[PDB]
C-alpha cells in the first residue's frame, strides 16, 4: 500500500523556510500512530530539516547524491525504487516529492489545518472528483492544540 502523509493549511501551505509553520501535537500523535512499524519515504531536503531518523519505523531518503550515508537511514536514488519496498509505505514529503507522487499513490492521509499561515512550500492541488472521503474526523482542541484541524483519509476513485 502506497499512501501520502501530509499536513497542509487552507491554502495548501506545507512549510516555511525549511520547516513546519505550526506546532500541533495531535498531528504528531496522528503521524506516530499511523507510521510506526512501517516505512517513511522522504525527500533529501526534508530529512535535513528533521536531522535524525524517526524511531520505530523504516526511514528511506530519496536523493541523487550516491554518497549519501546516515546512521539508520536507507537510501534510494530513483522514483522507481519506491515500488520495490515491502509493507505500508508512506510518502512523507516534502513539496517536490508530493508533486511527483500524488498521481501514483493509492491512498492519502491529510491533516487539514483550518487556518492560513505564511509559507514557501505547498501541497499540489487536488479535486474531490478523483478522491473519495473514506473518513473525515475533527481534531480535539486543548491548551496544547489550539489550531482547528481535520483528519482526512482519501482513497483514489
Ligand atoms: N506539512 C507537511 O506534511 C510537510 C511539510 N514539509 C515542508 O516542505 C518543505 C520541503 O519541500 P522540498 O524543498 O521540496 O523538499 P524535499 O524533501 O521534497 O526535497 C526533495 C529533494 O530530494 C531529492 N529528490 C527528490 N526527488 C528526486 C528524484 N525523483 N530523483 C532523485 N532525487 C530526488 C532532491 O535533492 P537531491 O537529489 O539533490 O538530494 C530534492 O531536492 C519544507 O519546507 C518542509 O517544511 C515537508 C514534509 C512534510
Ligand atoms: C509532523 C508533521 C507532519 N504531519 C503530517 N500529517 N504529515 C507529514 N508528512 C508531516 C511531516 C513532516 C516533516 C517534519 C517532521 C518533523 C517532526 C517533528 C516532530 C516529530 C516528528 C517529526 C520535523 C520537521 C519536519 O520537516 C519540516
Author numbering: 1 to 157
Question: What's the paper's own text on this?
Answer:
Dihydrofolate reductase (DHFR) is a critical enzyme in the recycling of folate cofactors that are essential for the synthesis of deoxythymidine monophosphate and several amino acids. Using high resolution structural information, we have developed a new class of antifolates characterized by a unique propargylic linker that shows activity against an expanded set of enzymes from important pathogens. Using a structure-based approach, a series of propargyl-linked antifolates were designed, synthesized and shown to possess highly potent antibacterial activity against both MRSA and S. pyogenes.
A series of biphenyl derivatives, 7–11, probe the deletion of both propargylic and C-ring methyl groups, extension of the C6 alkyl group and the role of the B-ring alkoxy substituent. However, the contribution of the B-ring substituent was more pronounced (compare compounds 7 and 9), with a 2′-methoxy proving to be a more optimal placement, leading to a highly potent (2.4 nM and 5.9 nM) dual inhibitor of both S. aureus and S. pyogenes DHFR. However, a major difference that accounts for the 18-fold improvement in potency for compound 7 against S. aureus DHFR is the presence of a hydrogen bond (3.5 Å) between the 2′-methoxy substituent in compound 7 and the hydroxyl group of Ser 49, an interaction that is precluded with the 3′-methoxy in compound 1.
